[PDB]
Design a protein around this nucleic acid. Structure first.
Lengths: 106, 134, 69, 188, 170
RNA sequence: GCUCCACACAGAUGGAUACGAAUAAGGCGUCCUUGUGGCGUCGCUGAACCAUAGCAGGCUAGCAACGGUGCACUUGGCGGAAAGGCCUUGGGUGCUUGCUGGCGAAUUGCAAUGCGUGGGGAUAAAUCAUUUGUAUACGACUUAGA
RNA sequence: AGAACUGGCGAUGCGGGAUGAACCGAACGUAGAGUUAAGGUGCCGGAAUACACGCUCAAGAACAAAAUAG
RNA sequence: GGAAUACUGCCAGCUGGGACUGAGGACUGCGACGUAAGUCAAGGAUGCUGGCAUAAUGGUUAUAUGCCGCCCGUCUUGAAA
């Protein structure tokens, strides 16, 4: 097979925040091909992973992954809030994230 | 001789076939029955079961098809004219309706159906690439 | 898409069967028996063997919330 | 979705195009802008030459249309910050379509076109004219070598059209067959 | 949206004045509460009766008889402006009375910057015969076989990027 | 930089798929009335085209064509705006899922994304010493001697 | 000028208002989920370049005021 | 003449998807299922599975990232100063 992707690509925009106060515990994730809350409803509960290359060796690879979950929709343009065990470093604004299909409901 | 380009605009008129894009009756055909103002026009689509109600021109897109219809025609007369004019037959022949049907079929395609489509596309290409270059 | 699995005897398999306590010979025999019964039904329709041999993967523009699986 | 996006500035509003580009590349999307000289601003020549000298009479000022667009984009991004500085590194602005962007597809933004945004019968200004009036000295060369860009690219398009003619003929001759009907039945 | 409410009252009948005039008027409002409030305000303004000295006999919604027939309605508008008050008459072409009054209110808020508080709908009368309409912009839509185009459509594109360079044709 | 010795390491993972011009008009096919020509056809979005099946994609027996294509060769033109890229005549070697079959997957056990130094051999060049003065508060600048 | 009658603050965080003591909401144990106020939804900034009717080419977002529908 | 539909409200109607929460610690009580034995969603998470001793994980600090933070105490005063 040409493509081995089994996840929907997405972009990390920024944390939920006010004008002067931000909440790093809640991240906002944009899903490719999603522009309405109804479309984003299908992605609720799916595991979201962030993939980045590391400089130092790890327990059997060179890639480190931070896992998360989708919690609720955000805004009207299909934005969805995501939560992770470890919050993103805030340096991934505009980075690419992987939205897996499991757990499935189809 | 004199030259004038087509410039043919789809004019709003009684009996004009119109396809609704927004609202509960989205995707269904209708016919204009009367004109109220520059923005709102009365339509009827009894063939598709849409209720007779006023609709803004921004909520609907005019189709090139047209048929004769008296101004202010009621539901019965509108349905009679729609049946007589064979509006449904004309709509299916238009490439727009064919594209809509193709899009619906593609949306409804199953994964196994998608695999079959891929295999058939490969088979067709095997001959298409051989038809050319010689 | 659903195949007629009625012809496959699945009573032998249980939770304790998969207990992990070089592959056990009994497991290989059961797998062969299941495959022999299932292949006959799988081949009963076109492209089923090829379809199952193809690994599923996503493509650009694919919308899982729209794809009808 | 696209690793790099090339946007044709011609026919777009400076403000809307700048806002959309800022929002898009703030999310990490790489965007390239070409033919900035053809970018348009609402209103007739007066009130467009004005509002530029007003801030000019205050620093360094750039006359090139690309620099003007960058300044418009710069104010819509939180510059002086690492995120803002990093975001501005994903943007490229050039006059005309210098290579290798001339050999790649160029997209447009429907929600920023002058035609779809400006009401009919209203005057509009063009970036090239304003830049020339405020001291730009490269409009002549830009136009001259943009005209050459259309030259032989019309020929490339003609060759592509001829090739697609043969492709369509090959499809048609093979069409109506059993495989063709089977594909058409499944919406393909 | 709006609705038509018929409201009546007889200023709390008392001794020596049985069966009072039973004032009646067709109020337009989005709910029963607003209709009652406007009825009380109109009674206070135009009659020597107050809310504390009245009683709402009944309130029933009135729907247009033919919500499909296209009709023309003449309205005798009376409203308060920056200076005194000025009676106004206007003609609105609409399928139903509710839509006509809503459009009239929008026009008043647009061409006169007047709001629901200062606008009073004295009477709305249907007109059907031609040559009875007076306003030119209403006669504009009464010609036989009227046809006009819709040039320069602005159909919206969901995606931010388009490779088609869309045309405004219709 | 030529050579020896000694050490060392802001986010590809399908394809950025290329005429120009208008938006109160445009393309596509045909033909003659070669022109601001007649006809049919299309938009109402990219929801499109390529390719997409094989252990992170193997081994291997046949059929149908003389095609599609990866890699290294070779011929010709082309791209100066930041060309540095585009094809392309010819042959070489692999795959081909276009079609018909066989061999293996297991146990990871129910998911944990799954690249230059710091020391030597020769040497092209710079600064200082000297001198020069068309330079001069100190830097700097201006000349020449194997 | 002189007062004075009730009230906002005296010692008052927090959200919005480019900032502010006279504005609006709201007054305080440590955190999570959820719903809101004023205030906003082209970017800075989280959110509809939402929908519908008209207005204006120039700004537009108490003082130099008096001269497109009926 | 008759269907409906449009709208308000009711369902001690049914049926899913998403997020946080697992607090108490042998039985005393209010309730349902069932002729009974017994069971239960009835005054607070139960069971299974998966990784682990050159562990799994957690901790200290330098930088960095999105946002916020006028220099400390005293007195003037109704305030900032």
């Amino acid at each position: 097979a040409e493509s081995h992707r089994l996840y929907v690509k997405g972009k990390h925009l920024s944390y939920q925040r006010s004008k002067r106060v931000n909440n790093p515990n809640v991240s906002l994730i944009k899903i490719e091909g999603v522009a309405t809350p109804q479309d984003a409803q299908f992605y609720l509960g799916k595991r979201i992973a962030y993939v980045y290359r590391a400089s130092k060796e790890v327990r059997g690879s060179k890639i480190r992954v931070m896992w998360g979950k989708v919690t609720r929709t955000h805004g009207n343009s299909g934005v969805v809030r995501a939560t992770f065990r470890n919050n993103l470093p805030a340096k991934t604004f505009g980075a690419s994230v992987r939205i897996f299909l499991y757990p499935s409901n189809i | 001789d004199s030259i004038v380009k087509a410039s043919n605009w789809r004019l709003v008129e009684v009996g004009r076939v119109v396809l609704i894009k927004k609202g509960q009756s989205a995707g269904k055909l209708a016919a204009i029955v009367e004109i109220i103002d520059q923005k709102k026009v009365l339509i009827d689509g009894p063939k598709a079961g849409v209720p007779r109600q006023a609709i803004n021109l921004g909520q609907v897109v005019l189709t090139p098809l047209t048929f004769a219809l008296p101004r202010g025609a009621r539901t019965a007369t509108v349905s009679k004219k729609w049946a007589a004019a064979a509006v449904c037959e004309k709509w299916a022949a238009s490439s727009w309706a064919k594209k809509i049907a193709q899009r619906e079929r593609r949306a409804a395609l199953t994964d196994f159906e998608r695999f079959q489509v891929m295999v058939l596309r490969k088979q067709k290409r095997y001959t298409v690439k051989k038809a050319l270059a010689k | 898409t659903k195949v007629s699995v009625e012809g496959v005897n699945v009573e032998k398999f249980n939770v304790e069967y998969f207990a992990k306590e070089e592959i056990k010979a009994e497991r290989v025999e059961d797998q062969k028996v299941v495959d022999k019964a299932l292949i006959a039904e799988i081949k009963k329709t076109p492209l089923l063997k090829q379809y199952l041999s193809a690994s599923f993967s996503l493509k650009n523009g694919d919308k899982p919330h729209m794809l009808k699986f | 979705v696209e690793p790099v996006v090339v946007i044709d500035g011609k026919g777009h509003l400076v403000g809307r195009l700048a806002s959309v580009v800022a929002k898009q590349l703030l999310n990490g999307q790489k965007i390239v802008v070409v033919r900035a000289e053809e970018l348009n601003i609402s209103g007739e020549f007066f009130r467009n030459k004005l509002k530029y000298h007003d801030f000019l009479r205050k620093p360094f000022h750039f006359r090139a249309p690309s620099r003007i667009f960058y300044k418009a984009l710069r104010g819509m991004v939180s510059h002086k910050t690492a995120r803002g500085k990093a975001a501005l590194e994903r943007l490229k602005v050039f006059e005309g379509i210098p290579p290798p962007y001339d050999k790649k597809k160029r997209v447009v933004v429907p929600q920023a076109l002058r035609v779809l945004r400006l009401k009919p019968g209203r005057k509009y200004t063009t970036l090239g004219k304003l830049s020339t009036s405020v001291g730009w000295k490269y409009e002549d060369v830009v136009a001259k070598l943009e005209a050459k860009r259309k030259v032989s690219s019309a020929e490339y398009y003609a060759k592509k059209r001829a090739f697609t003619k043969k492709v369509a003929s090959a499809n048609a001759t093979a069409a109506e067959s059993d495989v063709a009907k089977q594909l058409a039945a499944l919406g393909y | 949206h709006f609705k038509e409410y018929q409201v009546i009252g007889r200023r709390l009948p008392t001794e020596s004045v049985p069966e009072p005039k039973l004032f009646r008027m067709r109020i337009f409002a989005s709910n029963e509460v607003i209709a009652k409030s406007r009825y009380w305000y109109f009674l206070q303004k135009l009659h020597k009766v107050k809310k504390a000295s009245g009683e709402i006999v009944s309130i029933n919604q009135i729907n247009e008889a033919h919500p499909t027939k296209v009709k023309n309605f003449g309205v005798w508008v009376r409203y308060d402006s920056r200076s005194g008050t000025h009676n106004m008459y206007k003609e609105i072409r609409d399928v139903s009375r509710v839509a006509a009054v809503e459009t009239l209110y929008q026009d008043m808020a647009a061409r006169h910057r007047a709001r629901f508080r200062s606008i009073h709908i004295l009477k709305v009368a249907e007109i059907e015969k031609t040559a009875d309409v007076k306003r030119q912009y209403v006669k504009q839509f009464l010609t036989k076989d009227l046809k006009f185009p819709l040039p320069h459509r602005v159909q919206k594109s969901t995606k931010t990027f388009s490779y088609k360079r869309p045309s405004t044709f219709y």
